[PDB]
Ligand binder design. Structure first.
Ligand SMILES: COc1cc(C(=O)N2CCC(N3CCN(C)CC3)CC2)ccc1Nc1ncc2c(n1)N(C)c1ccccc1C(=O)N2C
Length: 125
């Protein structure tokens, strides 16, 4: 079995920026989720080989995870906050697509997403 290459975290052709909102996304939003007790499944790409999920990447064609997001933020990969917020949303969405209501992993995602929403509610404007 094989995992796909992970999402890129640097791109020499992609314009870079660090806005005050992107700084907040790294230093407040990502940091807060990363330290949460339920962060661990989301700190790296889904390893479909080690988790024995042979259909994961048949179903999920836009993978995302907080390890990737963290590196993107550290590299100033994003131009704007919305790109980063979209990556968080993709990560959560993938979990809900692949898994089922009431699954432990879904409950964990929901708790993290609630915290995510609380923190981005106060993005500096
Ligand atoms: C750090 O990477 C992982 C480690 C482990 C793992 O074996 N352990 C050791 C045991 C440990 N538990 C010990 C018992 N304790 C009560 C809770 C903690 C948790 C960590 C398990 C999963 C890991 N990564 C992981 N990535 C993405 C997933 C996913 N899993 N889960 C939960 C999924 C499982 C099935 C299908 C999909 C997923 C999934 O969507 N994601 C995001």
């Amino acid at each position: 079995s094989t995992n796909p290459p992970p999402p890129e975290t640097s791109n020499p052709n992609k314009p870079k920026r660090q806005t005050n909102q992107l700084q907040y996304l790294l230093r407040v939003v990502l940091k807060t989720l990363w330290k949460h007790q339920f962060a661990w499944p989301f700190q790296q790409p889904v390893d479909a080989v080690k988790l024995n999920l042979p259909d994961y990447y048949k179903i999920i064609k836009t993978p995302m995870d907080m390890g990737t997001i963290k590196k993107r933020l550290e590299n100033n990969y994003y131009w704007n906050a919305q790109e980063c917020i979209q990556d968080f949303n993709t990560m959560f969405t993938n979990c809900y697509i692949y898994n089922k209501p009431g699954d432990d992993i879904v409950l964990m995602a929901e708790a993290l997403e609630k915290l995510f929403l609380q923190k981005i509610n106060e993005l500096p404007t």
